[PDB]
Amino acid sequence: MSLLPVPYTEAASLSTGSTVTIKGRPLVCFLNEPYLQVDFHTEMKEESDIVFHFQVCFGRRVVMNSREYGAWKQQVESKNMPFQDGQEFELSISVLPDKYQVMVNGQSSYTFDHRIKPEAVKMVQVWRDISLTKFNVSYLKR
Amino acid sequence: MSLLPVPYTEAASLSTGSTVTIKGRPLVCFLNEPYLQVDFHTEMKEESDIVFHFQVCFGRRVVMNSREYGAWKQQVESKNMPFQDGQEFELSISVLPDKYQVMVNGQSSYTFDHRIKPEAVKMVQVWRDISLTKFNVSYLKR
Ligand SMILES: OC[C@H]1O[C@@H](O)[C@@H](O)[C@@H](O)[C@@H]1O
Ligand SMILES: OC[C@H]1O[C@@H](O)[C@@H](O)[C@@H](O)[C@@H]1O
């Protein structure tokens, strides 16, 4: 169905029990090393701080970090690569009490402990070398 | 004027005296590290070999390489960064006898010696985190 704009920006609120659901596909083959980035921002401004930075180099690695008062903190690097060459992916990011949990196509794949309270989030941006068909933030919980 | 599709693909031929002219802008601020990539390919297929790979991490560095029978060769890394935060750029890549020369906004900025004859080029792709308003390959010379 219909392609969403990329870069994709949605005003957002997160707390324990929130889920962020993303369906998309890499624009090109893994040999060409397309990226995916998901940033949970503290303001609508793109230069604002990032509570949770998630950056996939498809076929190679994933880095997670925070950007706090304009400065990148301690990088976490994973070689875990559940994404499949040439395939649509479904990404879901759950806000648990102590961490973000990243599911890829239904499989727990990455976690990242909260450095800043999730309530600081005001915006989610999804960008780099993908098409997007679906984006949702859940708002069911108190 | 009118935005070209990104990723941008044009069938191309190059030889000594050819110029490739690119006008675009980074989609986001340099703090968010948008990329630009220009690949001179040996076939229309995106998985084909790359005679000249040019990859800008805006505000940080540039890497140049070739991908030959599916394998990346010796990386050349530059910290030269003439690109200006938030600005439109004009990139021109001249095919000289012994190298590619990269001009940024009229300023000689990078060169890369031919590893494969430029006549092997059949396609140029321009992609990653930019908008494009202009792309030209010159065809004036014998
Ligand atoms: O300069 C190093 C920093 O650069 C940024 O682009 C992110 O990749 C961070 O994860 C990293 O710590
Ligand atoms: O694996 C290392 C290689 O990876 C590719 O993505 C390019 O960046 C090459 O310049 C580099 O040599």
Coordinates of C-alpha atoms and ligand atoms in Angstrom, one line a residue:
Chain A
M1 CA 0.0 0.0 0.0
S2 CA 0.9 3.8 0.1
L3 CA 4.5 4.9 0.6
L4 CA 4.9 7.3 3.6
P5 CA 7.4 10.2 3.2
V6 CA 11.1 9.4 4.1
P7 CA 12.5 11.0 6.1
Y8 CA 9.4 10.3 8.2
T9 CA 8.6 12.6 11.2
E10 CA 5.8 12.0 13.8
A11 CA 5.2 14.0 17.0
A12 CA 5.1 11.2 19.7
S13 CA 4.7 10.4 23.5
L14 CA 6.2 7.3 25.0
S15 CA 5.9 5.6 28.4
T16 CA 6.1 2.0 29.8
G17 CA 3.8 -0.2 27.6
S18 CA 4.1 2.0 24.4
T19 CA 5.0 0.2 21.2
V20 CA 6.4 1.8 18.0
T21 CA 5.6 -0.4 14.9
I22 CA 7.5 0.2 11.6
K23 CA 7.0 -1.7 8.3
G24 CA 9.4 -0.9 5.4
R25 CA 12.0 -2.3 3.0
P26 CA 15.6 -1.4 2.2
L27 CA 15.8 0.6 -1.1
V28 CA 18.8 -1.5 -2.5
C29 CA 20.6 -4.8 -2.0
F30 CA 22.7 -5.4 1.1
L31 CA 26.0 -5.5 -1.0
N32 CA 25.4 -1.6 -1.3
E33 CA 25.1 -1.2 2.5
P34 CA 21.8 0.7 2.8
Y35 CA 21.2 2.2 6.3
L36 CA 18.1 2.5 8.5
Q37 CA 17.9 5.0 11.3
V38 CA 15.2 5.4 14.1
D39 CA 15.7 8.4 16.5
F40 CA 13.5 9.1 19.5
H41 CA 13.9 12.9 19.9
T42 CA 13.3 15.3 22.9
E43 CA 11.8 18.0 20.6
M44 CA 10.3 18.4 17.1
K45 CA 13.6 20.1 15.9
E46 CA 15.8 17.5 14.1
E47 CA 19.0 18.9 15.9
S48 CA 17.3 18.1 19.4
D49 CA 18.7 15.4 21.8
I50 CA 18.1 11.7 21.1
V51 CA 17.0 9.5 24.0
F52 CA 17.3 6.4 21.7
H53 CA 19.4 6.3 18.4
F54 CA 19.1 3.0 16.4
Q55 CA 21.2 2.8 13.2
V56 CA 21.3 -0.4 11.0
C57 CA 24.0 -0.9 8.3
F58 CA 22.0 -3.7 6.6
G59 CA 24.1 -6.9 6.3
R60 CA 26.9 -5.6 8.7
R61 CA 26.1 -4.1 12.1
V62 CA 23.8 -2.0 14.3
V63 CA 24.9 0.9 16.6
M64 CA 22.7 2.3 19.4
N65 CA 23.4 5.5 21.4
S66 CA 22.0 8.7 22.9
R67 CA 22.8 12.3 22.0
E68 CA 22.6 14.4 25.2
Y69 CA 23.0 18.2 25.3
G70 CA 24.3 17.9 21.7
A71 CA 27.0 15.2 22.5
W72 CA 26.9 11.5 21.5
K73 CA 27.4 9.2 24.6
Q74 CA 28.7 5.5 24.8
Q75 CA 28.1 3.6 21.5
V76 CA 26.6 0.0 21.8
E77 CA 27.6 -2.0 18.7
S78 CA 25.8 -5.3 17.7
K79 CA 26.7 -7.7 14.9
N80 CA 23.2 -9.4 15.3
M81 CA 21.6 -9.1 11.8
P82 CA 18.2 -10.7 11.5
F83 CA 17.2 -8.5 8.5
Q84 CA 17.1 -10.5 5.2
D85 CA 18.6 -9.2 1.9
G86 CA 15.8 -7.7 -0.4
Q87 CA 13.0 -8.4 2.1
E88 CA 10.3 -6.2 3.7
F89 CA 10.9 -6.0 7.5
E90 CA 8.5 -5.3 10.5
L91 CA 10.3 -3.5 13.3
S92 CA 8.6 -3.1 16.7
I93 CA 10.2 -1.1 19.6
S94 CA 8.5 -1.8 23.0
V95 CA 9.0 0.6 26.0
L96 CA 9.7 -1.8 28.9
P97 CA 10.4 -0.6 32.5
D98 CA 14.2 -0.6 32.2
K99 CA 14.9 -0.6 28.4
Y100 CA 13.7 -0.4 24.7
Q101 CA 13.3 -3.9 23.2
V102 CA 13.6 -4.2 19.4
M103 CA 11.7 -7.0 17.6
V104 CA 12.6 -7.7 14.0
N105 CA 10.0 -9.8 12.1
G106 CA 8.6 -11.1 15.5
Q107 CA 12.2 -12.0 16.9
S108 CA 13.7 -10.1 19.9
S109 CA 16.9 -8.7 18.4
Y110 CA 18.3 -5.7 20.4
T111 CA 17.7 -4.1 23.8
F112 CA 18.9 -0.7 25.1
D113 CA 18.6 0.4 28.8
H114 CA 16.9 3.8 29.4
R115 CA 19.5 6.6 29.8
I116 CA 16.8 9.3 29.9
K117 CA 13.1 8.7 30.9
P118 CA 11.0 7.8 27.9
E119 CA 8.6 10.7 28.9
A120 CA 11.3 13.1 27.6
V121 CA 10.4 11.9 24.0
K122 CA 8.4 14.4 21.8
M123 CA 9.2 13.1 18.2
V124 CA 10.2 9.9 16.3
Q125 CA 12.1 10.2 13.0
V126 CA 12.6 7.2 10.6
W127 CA 15.1 7.8 7.8
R128 CA 18.0 6.7 5.5
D129 CA 17.8 4.1 2.7
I130 CA 14.3 2.6 3.2
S131 CA 10.7 2.9 1.9
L132 CA 8.0 2.9 4.7
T133 CA 4.4 1.5 4.3
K134 CA 3.4 1.6 8.1
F135 CA 4.3 3.6 11.2
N136 CA 2.3 3.4 14.5
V137 CA 2.8 4.6 18.1
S138 CA 0.4 2.9 20.5
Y139 CA -1.5 5.1 23.1
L140 CA -3.7 2.5 24.9
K141 CA -2.1 2.6 28.4
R142 CA -2.4 5.0 31.4
Chain B
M1 CA 13.0 23.6 -9.5
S2 CA 11.8 19.9 -9.8
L3 CA 13.1 17.2 -7.5
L4 CA 14.7 14.2 -9.3
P5 CA 14.0 10.7 -7.8
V6 CA 16.5 9.5 -5.1
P7 CA 18.0 7.0 -5.4
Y8 CA 18.8 8.4 -8.8
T9 CA 20.0 6.1 -11.6
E10 CA 21.1 7.2 -15.1
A11 CA 22.7 4.9 -17.8
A12 CA 26.1 6.6 -18.6
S13 CA 29.3 6.5 -20.7
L14 CA 32.5 8.2 -19.5
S15 CA 35.9 8.9 -21.0
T16 CA 38.7 11.5 -20.7
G17 CA 37.0 15.0 -20.8
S18 CA 33.5 13.8 -19.5
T19 CA 32.0 15.8 -16.6
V20 CA 29.3 14.6 -14.2
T21 CA 27.4 17.6 -12.6
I22 CA 25.2 17.1 -9.5
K23 CA 23.2 19.9 -7.7
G24 CA 21.4 18.9 -4.5
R25 CA 21.1 19.5 -0.8
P26 CA 21.4 17.4 2.4
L27 CA 18.0 16.4 3.7
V28 CA 18.9 17.2 7.4
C29 CA 21.5 19.2 9.5
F30 CA 25.1 18.0 9.7
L31 CA 24.6 17.1 13.5
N32 CA 22.5 14.2 12.3
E33 CA 25.3 13.0 9.8
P34 CA 23.4 12.7 6.5
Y35 CA 25.3 10.8 3.8
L36 CA 25.8 11.4 0.1
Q37 CA 27.0 8.5 -2.2
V38 CA 27.9 8.6 -5.9
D39 CA 28.8 5.2 -7.6
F40 CA 30.1 4.8 -11.1
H41 CA 28.9 1.2 -12.0
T42 CA 30.1 -1.3 -14.7
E43 CA 26.4 -2.4 -15.4
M44 CA 22.8 -1.1 -14.8
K45 CA 22.4 -3.7 -12.0
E46 CA 22.9 -2.1 -8.6
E47 CA 25.0 -5.1 -7.3
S48 CA 27.5 -4.6 -10.2
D49 CA 31.1 -3.5 -9.7
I50 CA 32.0 0.1 -8.9
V51 CA 34.9 1.8 -10.7
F52 CA 34.5 4.9 -8.5
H53 CA 32.7 5.0 -5.1
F54 CA 32.4 8.4 -3.4
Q55 CA 30.7 8.5 0.0
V56 CA 30.4 11.7 2.1
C57 CA 29.5 11.7 5.8
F58 CA 28.5 15.4 5.9
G59 CA 30.5 17.3 8.5
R60 CA 32.9 14.4 9.2
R61 CA 34.7 12.6 6.4
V62 CA 34.7 11.2 2.8
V63 CA 35.7 7.6 1.7
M64 CA 36.6 6.6 -1.9
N65 CA 37.0 3.1 -3.1
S66 CA 36.3 0.6 -5.9
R67 CA 34.3 -2.7 -5.7
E68 CA 35.9 -5.2 -8.1
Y69 CA 34.4 -8.7 -8.8
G70 CA 32.1 -8.0 -5.8
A71 CA 35.0 -7.1 -3.3
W72 CA 35.9 -3.7 -1.9
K73 CA 39.6 -2.6 -2.5
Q74 CA 41.8 -0.1 -0.7
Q75 CA 39.8 2.7 1.0
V76 CA 41.0 6.3 0.6
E77 CA 39.7 8.4 3.6
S78 CA 39.7 12.3 3.5
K79 CA 38.8 14.7 6.4
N80 CA 38.5 17.5 3.7
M81 CA 34.9 18.9 4.2
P82 CA 34.1 21.9 1.9
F83 CA 30.3 21.2 2.2
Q84 CA 28.5 23.8 4.3
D85 CA 25.7 22.9 6.9
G86 CA 22.2 23.4 5.5
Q87 CA 23.4 24.6 2.1
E88 CA 22.7 23.5 -1.5
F89 CA 25.9 22.0 -3.1
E90 CA 27.1 21.8 -6.7
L91 CA 29.4 18.7 -7.3
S92 CA 31.3 18.2 -10.5
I93 CA 33.3 15.1 -11.2
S94 CA 35.8 15.5 -14.2
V95 CA 37.3 12.4 -16.0
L96 CA 41.0 13.5 -16.3
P97 CA 43.6 11.2 -18.0
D98 CA 44.9 9.6 -14.7
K99 CA 42.1 10.3 -12.2
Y100 CA 38.6 11.6 -11.3
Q101 CA 38.7 15.2 -9.9
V102 CA 35.8 16.2 -7.6
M103 CA 35.0 19.9 -7.4
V104 CA 32.6 21.1 -4.6
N105 CA 31.0 24.5 -5.2
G106 CA 33.8 25.3 -7.8
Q107 CA 36.7 24.2 -5.5
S108 CA 38.9 21.2 -6.3
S109 CA 38.3 18.9 -3.2
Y110 CA 39.1 15.2 -3.9
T111 CA 40.9 13.2 -6.6
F112 CA 41.0 9.4 -7.2
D113 CA 43.4 7.7 -9.6
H114 CA 41.7 5.3 -12.2
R115 CA 41.9 1.7 -11.0
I116 CA 39.7 0.5 -14.0
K117 CA 39.4 2.4 -17.4
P118 CA 36.5 4.9 -17.2
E119 CA 35.1 3.2 -20.5
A120 CA 34.0 0.3 -18.2
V121 CA 31.3 2.6 -16.7
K122 CA 27.7 1.9 -17.8
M123 CA 25.6 3.6 -15.0
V124 CA 25.8 6.4 -12.4
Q125 CA 23.8 6.2 -9.1
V126 CA 23.4 9.1 -6.7
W127 CA 21.7 8.2 -3.4
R128 CA 21.5 8.4 0.5
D129 CA 20.3 11.5 2.4
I130 CA 20.0 14.3 -0.3
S131 CA 17.4 15.9 -2.6
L132 CA 18.6 16.4 -6.2
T133 CA 17.5 19.2 -8.6
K134 CA 20.2 18.6 -11.4
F135 CA 22.2 15.7 -12.9
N136 CA 24.2 15.9 -16.1
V137 CA 26.8 13.7 -17.9
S138 CA 28.6 15.7 -20.7
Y139 CA 28.9 13.9 -24.2
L140 CA 30.7 16.6 -26.2
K141 CA 34.1 14.9 -26.8
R142 CA 35.3 12.2 -29.3
Ligands
LIG1 O1 31.6 10.2 16.8 C1 31.1 8.9 17.3 C2 29.6 9.0 17.3 O2 29.1 9.3 16.0 C3 27.7 9.2 15.8 O3 27.5 9.4 14.4 C4 27.1 7.9 16.3 O4 27.5 6.9 15.5 C5 27.5 7.6 17.7 O5 27.0 6.3 18.0 C6 29.0 7.7 17.9 O6 29.5 7.5 19.2
LIG2 O1 34.4 -3.4 4.7 C1 35.1 -2.2 4.4 C2 34.6 -1.6 3.1 O2 33.2 -1.3 3.3 C3 32.5 -0.6 2.3 O3 31.3 -0.3 2.8 C4 33.2 0.7 1.8 O4 33.2 1.6 2.9 C5 34.7 0.4 1.6 O5 35.3 1.7 1.4 C6 35.4 -0.3 2.7 O6 36.7 -0.7 2.4

